[PDB]
């Protein structure tokens, strides 16, 4: 079963 | 081009990253903005299954469709 709360993969860390 | 042998020899801590870098662009071709989320969902699956998905568009499609169904039910 897949998890809808799994984290966004590959999102860049910037400000 | 990823074999089970090459993946398993990489440190467990970098295996998911290697799979992600390969999966994300394939998924982005189907879901241009949801690809990061769907990739995150799929990365929770066993690596053996993920390797098969990378090589087989029909297995990847069915897993992507499953993730999208799950997302549809959560808003």
Swiss-Prot record, chain A:
It comes from the Eukaryota. It is found in: Cytoplasm, Cytosol. Transmembrane segments: none annotated. Stimulates mRNA translation. Interacts with PABPC1. Interacts with RACK1. Associates with polysomes via the 40S ribosomal subunit. This is La-related protein 4B. It comes from Homo sapiens (Human). The lineage of its organism: Eukaryota, Metazoa, Chordata, Craniata, Vertebrata. The gene is LARP4B. The chain holds residues 55 to 69 of 738 of the full protein.
Curated annotation (Swiss-Prot), chain B:
Residues 1-75 are annotated as: (Microbial infection) Binding to HRSV M2-1 protein. Residues 1-75 form the PABC domain. Ubiquitous. Phosphorylated by MAPKAPK2. It is found in: Cytoplasm; Cytoplasm, Stress granule; Nucleus; Cell projection, Lamellipodium. It comes from the Eukaryota. Belongs to the polyadenylate-binding protein type-1 family. Many viruses shutoff host mRNA translational machinery by inhibiting cellular PABPC1 activity using different mechanisms. Picornaviruses, caliciviruses or lentiviruses encode proteases that cleave PABPC1 at several defined sites in the proline-rich linker region between RRMs and the C-terminal domain. Rotaviruses, gammherpesviruses and bunyamwera virus relocalize PABPC1 from the cytoplasm to the nucleus thus altering its function. Many of these viruses translate their mRNA in a PABPC1-independent manner and are unaffected by host PABPC1 inhibition. May form homodimers. Component of a multisubunit autoregulatory ribonucleoprotein complex (ARC), at least composed of IGF2BP1, PABPC1 and CSDE1. Directly interacts with IGF2BP1; the interaction is enhanced by SEPIN14P20 peptide RBPR. Part of a complex associated with the FOS mCRD domain and consisting of HNRPD, SYNCRIP, PAIP1 and CSDE1/UNR. Interacts with the PABPC1-interacting motif-1 (PAM1) and -2 (PAM2) of PAIP1 and PAIP2. Interacts with PAIP1 with a 1:1 stoichiometry and with PAIP2 with a 1:2 stoichiometry. The interaction with CSDE1 is direct and RNA-independent. (Microbial infection) Interacts (via C-terminus) with human cytomegalovirus/HHV-5 protein UL69. The RNA-binding domains RRM1 and RRM2 and the C-terminus (last 138 amino acids) regions interact with the PABPC1-interacting motif-1 (PAM1) and -2 (PAM2) of PAIP1, respectively. Binds the poly(A) tail of mRNA, including that of its own transcript, and regulates processes of mRNA metabolism such as pre-mRNA splicing and mRNA stability. Its function in translational initiation regulation can either be enhanced by PAIP1 or repressed by PAIP2. Can probably bind to cytoplasmic RNA sequences other than poly(A) in vivo. Binds to N6-methyladenosine (m6A)-containing mRNAs and contributes to MYC stability by binding to m6A-containing MYC mRNAs. Involved in translationally coupled mRNA turnover. (Microbial infection) Positively regulates the replication of dengue virus (DENV). This is Polyadenylate-binding protein 1. It comes from Homo sapiens. The gene is PABPC1. The chain holds residues 544 to 618 of 636 of the full protein.
């Amino acid at each position: 079963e897949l998890n809808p709360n799994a984290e966004v993969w590959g999102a860049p860390v910037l400000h | 081009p990823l074999t089970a042998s090459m993946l398993a020899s990489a440190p467990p801590q970098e295996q998911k990253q290697m799979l992600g870098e390969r999966l994300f662009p394939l998924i982005q071709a189907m879901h241009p903005t949801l690809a990061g989320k769907i990739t995150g969902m799929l990365l929770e699956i066993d690596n053996s299954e993920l390797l098969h998905m990378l090589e087989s568009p029909e297995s990847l499609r069915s897993k992507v469709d499953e993730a999208v169904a799950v997302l549809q039910a959560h808003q």
